[PDB]
Curated annotation (Swiss-Prot), chain D:
The chain holds residues 420 to 502 of 753 of the full protein. It is found in: Cytoplasm. Belongs to the catalase family. HPII subfamily. It comes from the Bacteria. Decomposes hydrogen peroxide into water and oxygen; serves to protect cells from the toxic effects of hydrogen peroxide. This is Catalase HPII. Induction: By entry into stationary phase. Homotetramer. Residues 40-74 are annotated as: Disordered. It comes from Escherichia coli (strain K12).
């Protein structure tokens, strides 16, 4: 019609902008100059809109898209209205089956590059030269919940990376913890059914806090290691940018000489490790169920590209049996104190998709998609995964041509004798559709294995044994890994683990299941078992009190790489601060605050009791981003209150509760000038307390002290003080 | 191995119990004596479990459901393991496309009966006799969110009833407000796309609080009436038991003489009308996203059967 | 490798060659410089093969495409063999549901061009200028059989044309007869189920000759007009190039002033009308079930492009009720004597597809696909069709994005707010997916109807009446059109119709059905009724002999344009002759023979009792195309036997049968020199017979005679004589 | 999965076993059977682990594969004995 | 006609239900990033009821224009000023 506003404010600038500054938009319109080989190859299917006539799918221009064709303007709709029927038919069949697991996920485009050639240990082309750039598409996810469930639940997270290499797609399909819950893929449907919503009523969504999960866990002790990780703060990451990624399974690297090296894949977050606290995560599932999806997308639009370092744990073939645990058991981690992670390369996620459905929802990742230079192992969970991810896309993506959906297509050549199938896009001109043929001189042809550009050949591992449905005896140990994890955590991390188990078991209706899990915990660590038992009103028996603790893992009594926080790895860039405004802010405080945050890449959101604008003491007009209730403290990392007319918000329930909530959740709070009158809201001593920044003005060291607190993420020393507090 | 506790406390007593007194269970096990013609007719496909062997779908008993078939106990999985492949194949194809709209919903079985014969205004068989009962199956829902989204969002709610009558199925597919947002069905995809999560990033879930919805409303003043109802406390009902239901459209009733009467359908909640307050409703989407689903299920297990006039 | 023969004889020349001179090939390899806008736009999805490596669909090169991965070379296949699983998975899902009706069909690409601008009667862009070339894709088909059924069955044929216009796809979905069997689309499932294989045992394939079909016809007299056409030789076309096409329904042309003109669409074969005879057609279903598909493909490879003239019957809106039939009744034809066909343009089919499945099997045509300048009418059969052809593709082609399958894509712009759906190819960048919107300034936008490039607006026909499920009383006449058709046929065409009814009804097991059908024939024409009755051993009653014949159609007692052969229109270019060789052929006969055929564009196939070659009297080495049994007379239009050593084949039973079969099927036979010894096997008098060319040698007079016979297609005067030929 | 529309093709009448079939598989397109088991996983205590595994035996026993000896490298190779 | 039914609904609500309607609109429009959309919706509320339009505008920091303050309320629905 010409409905947009004449000032052109309906459209976001095509330049990096902080979260909340402009309306978000499709990647290619937001960052048109951000390109890569894969992004460029999708140009054949990108569709624009501006200046085009509205049509049917058959290209017929529509004159009136506001009405159905009827006999009389109040008459019946006619069957001949093909414009209406096409438009409703397409709407009526928009949905496709969601992923069986990991249905909730958020994705982005980026690129990877190795630091140096790894040709001595692998012939994989994407790892052969530091100047070879490989486009990637990454999808992060939860596990149990549907595609419409919430982001900040307590659960493992998926981390899947599609590498578009010159010798084929390589999908590295991992999670955010270094082990899985079960050992053999045959039990995957039992474990998943137990964690998913129960079958009679389909409750609960996005939560393992229910009877069937804890029933299965209590009967299958192999699950305890990953359950410990889920009950820790690892289960509630602050962002997909601040969590680790792992392939879990031991795979193989194969070099040109045919030597095999065992390898476990790692991703290290260059923004550091950081998690929420349970009350915050749970409440944030209501206040903003799309918090992680939102934070990922906004980070990329702001230029805070998610960056990860790919690393390898490498173990020589001859050391297969040198550890206390089996290398092929996916419920066991390889302690970094035993086998260090070797830095391999960096991945940078720097562009959002254009259309979520087309690129995110239809993407298909599968761990069987490997390339020459990589190979599998006999890990029994990985072995069964190889069957499932090709199988499942026959219903999810409608057929066997899912590699032809734009986001999934290889950027390297693909040619073979496969034909037809639903939705076939490629029109083959080969005279032959079989080999061997003479009618096309046998093309396309097989290629012998070789150092570069050769055909895939499996490593000739020796296989010896009878055909058995049997778990290796070497996998029958379930408590030392859980115990190593427990002992590696800080005291506040241990408390959060105890609280996670306590909260989840309190939602288990059948008391005997609680009792049975507590008995399993007594096989891991007595302190942990006693603390959870106490919270459940359960007393350990004398037998439980004397269960001997599992042995150390290869002599280790702890490994600090297992803790999120034991070793500081703080990074403030991309964090966000709530600034609580008043109707006459001291502009000098705000100038100091905003400029210090901007110099460190820390975002801010100006909050007030209404929307619109407020005018500072010097006449500066301040645009309000959101109200106190509209953008709760759950969404920020720290809270700053500048001086001015504090009487304006001193008695505002929301403004006070904002600080109580952030204080409860261990976030740094800074109060300037008269804003120190809020100290009584959070009961802060006159002398002050570690974790609260306070001064006569926001000058001098006020912002540096606040930023130091943000670098340590949360104020763990405040835990004992929050215990009480009615918030 | 892994067996029921000695005391029998793993299984819910089959009698009406208050919320939280017993673990919830499938209806036919919770209330085996509760019947109606539709519930009885579903007996051909109900499948039990106690005392039966674990099998493949082809009926072959399974000896070891804990392991894949491999060459050696630390060896590769064999392709001949058909037990594993059937089991994982069925898991791999569990999901079906969710509803385009109203994908999140909660349902129950029940029955309907007219107060008196309505034969003077309609020849419909299910409304012809006060002592002639008609089985029903009712689904309550939200509109925008996926099947895994939260219950206590701010939104219109669906209220659909399937009447299994002697002369055919009658579905009364209504909502909890007496009007809809738009006038012509040709605009349905435009309105639904405007309220659904935005196409670039698929945010936000279960919320009309976002630019495209208010853009559409601002350009299409026909939407204001139902938007008023959604912004009121009608948009955040306390329970599915405590909201009204309406067919919205004028339909016709046709009697045996051929006379047509225009009719609009209503459901009155005999538990009364009651809604949450916003702060409560929004926080409850995070503390218990399945609150309405749970509340309906438990009211029926407790004997507080949802009743509507 | 190198399996191709060193001489390069595995690959067909990329130049026009006669049927059987080279192996057939994908269209783009056979005729790479035959281009059109649609063919060029498919280049993005065409995939080659030569010189490429064999890969998985994920782009991974394969080393050994001959073996599965196993533990030991006689061991069990491993689940980790992803190369095997991908290849078998694709194979396992190659098939898609066939079309409900018209599953058997053969297709080609071409182009259309108008003879003059039709802007005075229609604003349809493709008809606006003689220099506007519109790419087309045409699929010809039978109706009842599966996709694997035979071509030369007795049945109506489908003739579907997809026009890729600059203002949208226009599909003209018609048949080879001018009416349909039923009046309202609500009965289509009943008619179709009655003609299809019966439900208990799924017999018979590709045949109406069974009880349920004749049961339905006997109880629904509206079907009799199309049944008459099916029982005539119209039901057994010689080739898709030699049949007419009709849209059947009255549609509307709309001009720039908004005036509506009723129109019926026609396709006139520029190669002339020609049909087989029943025994030849039925036997040809067994000797070559692919005969019509082959004939179409090979005509195009030879440069005998199928050409049709588009024709319109135009009736002013004010003449709606001036006929004695209803213009909206699809069981009624508009006699060309009353309303002439205006010649409007030409369509030429000049290129075969590259991949049958991708382009033919997946093509989707629908009569509802119209463009501005065209509109529907209330014909109750066309009205219901409008719902079906969009609905059926949701299962057949897997979803609502079937317009994105390459062959179905418009070549003109298409932009709208529809999104998602299974296998979504297009990646939309529009910030908005709804209208009205302000965030993209309401694009893509609606367009007002107009003279050119305007949006679609339906013609504002007045609708008055009650909502009823009622047949118009004006459609209640069922015998006058059938009679008009009958009286328009030649005496031998009449005899063939009698023979068609008689043969089909003999296969009806319930005698009462045969009698009820004969009763219907008595309401059409007594002579027809009596002759069919006599072949069934049925006696017309007193009452049936006195049924008054239906009235003439608007004064007509016949219309020669309804006959296949009444008005000469034959064309020999593209026809084929079988030449029966001996071991010492009179080379002078062959030269005269082949020089004369080549001047008329008539092909030849050289046959012998074995493959390889024979050597003529002068030493010319003649290559053999097929044996006498290998390429039966059914597959050729005429038979020529040159002199030489007749003794060699004079006692060859296959050689004698070849002539007896061709004789019986009314084909021209030419005998030179001692080839005249074969007159005894087909019992031809010493003085000769019209239809048999004989002479001392094969000079130019002999060939002109033979080519004259071939232009008249068949020797109809020989019918009375074939009775006594045991063949 | 494509020919018969999904993983519940054993529920199409002609394919149905005449002997008992019980397991923990659920859902899928056109699911006919309505499972009443409180549990859809094993091991479970909430339904006392039913339906239960059965050891192999002379009659009515669970399926156990014959324990054939496997020995060799992981190869894509045709046995020479087949040539 | 788009405003009389909205108005009938508004006037039939109790004072605390009216406040909750105001709060619902205020909360939802505060999450609309583009300010002109908020303004356009406030303009539509001014065609329904000025008390409602002003209470929402106040929470959005918007000031109604003089023209908006003079929009005539829609007619009653068949004489009804409210329906409990
Ligand atoms: C045998 C079945 C099986 C097993 C044992 C696993 N999963 Fe899996 N997973 C699948 C069956 C599967 C799946 C049904 O095939 C899925 C869902 C839909 C899809 O495309 O893949 C899937 C999705 C899937 C995703 C989502 C990819 C995306 O974003 O689309 C990730 C991140 C994981 N899984 C990761 C893992 C890890 C790290 C595993 C253990 C080490 C694990 N899975 C075990
Ligand atoms: C109400 C349904 C109905 C009606 C009354 C008819 N058809 Fe039809 N026909 C269809 C329902 C259909 C179909 C179910 O929708 C099909 C099969 C699959 C599809 O794509 O289209 C089809 C295909 C189809 C084809 C094959 C298109 C191709 O090559 O793919 C042609 C030539 C015809 N039809 C022509 C006719 C004619 C000239 C009709 C009467 C005048 C007739 N149809 C009436």
């Amino acid at each position: 019609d010409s409905l947009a506003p004449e000032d052109g404010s309906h459209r976001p600038a095509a330049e990096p902008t902080p979260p909340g500054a402009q309306p978000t938009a499709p990647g290619s319109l937001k960052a048109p100059d951000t390109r890569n080989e894969k992004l460029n190859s999708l140009e054949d299917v990108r569709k624009g809109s501006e200046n085009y006539a509205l049509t049917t799918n058959q290209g017929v221009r529509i004159a009136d898209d506001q009405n159905s064709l009827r006999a009389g303007s109040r008459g019946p709709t006619l069957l001949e209205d093909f414009i209406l029927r096409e438009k409703i038919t397409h709407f009526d069949h928009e949905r496709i089956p969601e992923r069986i697991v990991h249905a909730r996920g958020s994705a982005a485009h980026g690129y990877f590059q190795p630091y140096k050639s790894l040709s001595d240990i692998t012939k994989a082309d994407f790892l052969s030269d530091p100047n070879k750039i490989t486009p990637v598409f990454v999808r992060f996810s939860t596990v149990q919940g549907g595609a419409g469930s919430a982001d900040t639940v307590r659960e493992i997270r998926g981390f899947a990376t599609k590498f578009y290499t010159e010798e084929g797609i390589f999908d590295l399909v991992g999670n955010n913890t270094p082990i899985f819950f079960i050992q053999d893929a045959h039990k995957f449907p039992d474990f998943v059914h137990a964690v998913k919503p129960e079958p009679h009523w389909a409750i609960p969504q996005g939560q393992s806090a229910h009877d069937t999960f804890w029933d299965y866990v209590s009967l299958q002790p192999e699950t305890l290691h990953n359950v410990m990780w889920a009950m820790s703060d690892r289960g509630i990451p602050r962002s997909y940018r601040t969590m680790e990624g792992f392939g879990i399974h031991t795979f193989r690297l194969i070099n040109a000489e045919g030597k095999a090296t065992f390898v476990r894949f790692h991703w290290k977050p260059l923004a550091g490790k950081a998690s929420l606290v349970w009350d915050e995560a749970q409440k944030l599932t209501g206040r903003d169920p799309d918090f992680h999806r939102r934070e990922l997308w906004e980070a990329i639009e702001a230029g805070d590209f998610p960056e990860y370092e790919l690393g390898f744990q490498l173990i020589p073939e001859e050391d297969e049996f040198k550890f206390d645990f089996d290398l092929l058991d996916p419920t066991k981690l390889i302690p970094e104190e035993l086998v260090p992670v070797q830095r391999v390369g960096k991945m940078v996620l720097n562009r959002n998709p254009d259309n979520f459905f087309a690129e995110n929802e239809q993407a298909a990742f599968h761990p069987g998609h490997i390339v020459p230079g990589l190979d599998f192992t006999n890990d029994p969970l990985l072995q069964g995964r190889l069957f499932s991810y090709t199988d499942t896309q026959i219903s999810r993506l409608g057929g066997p041509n899912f590699h032809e959906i734009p986001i999934n297509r290889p950027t390297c050549p693909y040619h073979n004798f496969q034909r037809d199938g639903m939705h076939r896009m490629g029109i083959d001109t080969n005279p032959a559709n079989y080999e061997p043929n003479s009618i096309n001189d046998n093309w396309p042809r097989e290629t012998p294995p070789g150092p570069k550009r050769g055909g895939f050949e499996s490593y000739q591992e020796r296989v010896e044994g009878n055909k058995v449905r049997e778990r290796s005896p070497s996998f029958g140990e379930y408590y030392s890994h859980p115990r190593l994890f427990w002992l590696s955590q800080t005291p506040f991390e241990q408390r959060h683990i105890v609280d996670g188990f306590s909260f989840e078991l309190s939602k288990v209706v059948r008391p005997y299941i609680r009792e049975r899990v507590v008995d399993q915990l007594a096989h891991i660590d007595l302190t942990l078992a006693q603390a959870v038992a106490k919270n459940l009103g359960i007393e350990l028996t004398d037998d439980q009190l004397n269960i001997t603790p599992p042995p150390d893992v290869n002599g280790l009594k702890k490994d600090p790489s297992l803790s999120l926080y034991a070793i500081p790895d703080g990074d403030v860039k991309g964090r966000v601060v709530a600034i609580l405004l008043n109707d006459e802010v001291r502009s000098a405080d705000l100038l100091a605050i905003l400029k210090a945050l901007k110099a460190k890449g820390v975002h801010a959101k100006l909050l007030y009791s209404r929307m619109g604008e407020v005018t500072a003491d010097d006449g500066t007009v301040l645009p309000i981003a959101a109200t106190f209730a509209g953008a709760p403290s759950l969404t920020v990392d720290a809270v700053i209150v500048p001086c001015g007319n504090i009487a304006d918000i001193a008695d505002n329930g929301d403004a006070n509760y904002y600080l109580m909530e952030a204080y409860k959740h261990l976030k740094p709070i800074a109060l300037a000038g008269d804003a120190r009158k809020f100290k009584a809201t959070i009961k802060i001593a006159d002398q002050g307390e570690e974790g609260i920044v306070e001064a006569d003005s926001a000058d001098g060291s006020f912002m540096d002290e606040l930023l130091t607190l943000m670098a340590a993420h949360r104020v763990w020393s405040r835990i004992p003080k929050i215990d009480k507090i009615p918030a």
